[PDB]
Design a protein around this ligand. Structure first.
Ligand code: P0V
Length: 270
């Protein structure tokens, strides 16, 4: 093993192996290290609020809406879907790592051991005008999530053999940097994801810029350090057109990730 020197599961290829996401990725540690939302003025909270505001604007003031939205690399998180469940009749959340989708499956049952998204749900409700309070928002979301599937962005069929109608949208937060060891792997995954999108559908990606790693405590995972133009071009060569592309300076703390901001885009398959 490497021991901090380089990302775990990467001494050989240079990039954390996907089997490492089944070995050493503890979703409950991840949730508490990035989504506690306990103090709102952590570096983690400021980033999350921006993610939530972008999702709110994309899904509640912009057009993006429809019948099916497929979220890619959900991990064990549900925040990226709270504003989205207002505009899509059905949401299918996916992930590669069985540990993350069970920690997810615990949350749709509202099982007591589950992680508490209570305050995060609350912050999205006030954004959306306080039509509802938390518990109903969570219950609106829980009925919308209609499937929990094993997923792999590196495959010709990312979702394997599971049949689904073409999605009205595909979303992916903090995954592709984590899932793709290089630019050709990165570009291939965005074409694999287009495999699930109707023509003229929406691709919504938010990720980290020039980030070579992120931490969950002391276990270090690899991240593809991409710049805006690398991402801008990678998406363009996957067969999409970018309707909006935004970049913010705000970064994770040096202890958790060495990103230089995050990016946020809306694209459409040509
Ligand atoms: N880039 C940085 O430095 C950085 C900065 C800040 C945070 C993070 C993070 C992170 C964790 N992330 C989920 C987070 C997400 N839903 C969210 O919280 O927003 C990993 C996800 O990708 C895994 N995966 C791995 N291989 C895959 C493959 N081949 N196909 C499909 N999925 C694959 C999944 O297991 C899933 O867990 C990274």
């Amino acid at each position: 093993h490497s021991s901090g020197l380089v990302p775990r599961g990467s001494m050989e290829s240079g990039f954390t192996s996907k089997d490492t996401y089944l070995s050493h990725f503890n979703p409950r540690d991840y949730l508490e290290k990035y989504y506690k939302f306990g103090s709102r003025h952590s570096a983690e909270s400021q980033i999350l609020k921006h993610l939530l505001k972008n999702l709110f604007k994309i899904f509640c003031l912009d057009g993006v809406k429809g019948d099916l939205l497929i979220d890619i690399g959900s991990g064990p998180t549900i925040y990226q879907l709270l504003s989205a469940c207002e505009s899509f009749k059905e949401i299918v959340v996916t992930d590669y790592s069985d540990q993350n989708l069970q920690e997810l499956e615990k949350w749709l049952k509202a099982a007591p051991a589950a992680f508490d998204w209570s305050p995060v749900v609350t912050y999205v409700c006030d954004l959306e005008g306080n039509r509802v309070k938390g518990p109903e928002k969570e219950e609106k979301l829980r009925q919308a999530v209609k499937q929990v599937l094993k997923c792999d962005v590196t495959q010709s069929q990312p979702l394997g053999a599971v049949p689904l109608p073409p999605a009205d949208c595909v979303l992916s937060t903090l995954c592709l940097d984590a899932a793709c060891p290089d630019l050709p792997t990165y570009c291939r995954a965005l074409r694999n994801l287009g495999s699930l999108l109707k023509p003229g559908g929406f691709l919504v990606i938010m990720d980290a810029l020039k980030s070579s790693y992120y931490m969950i405590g002391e276990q270090k995972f690899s991240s593809l350090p991409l710049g805006r133009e690398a991402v801008e071009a990678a998406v363009k060569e996957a067969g999409y057109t970018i309707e909006w592309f935004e970049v913010i300076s705000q970064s994770y703390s040096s202890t958790m990730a060495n990103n230089e901001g995050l990016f946020s885009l809306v694209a459409r398959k040509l």
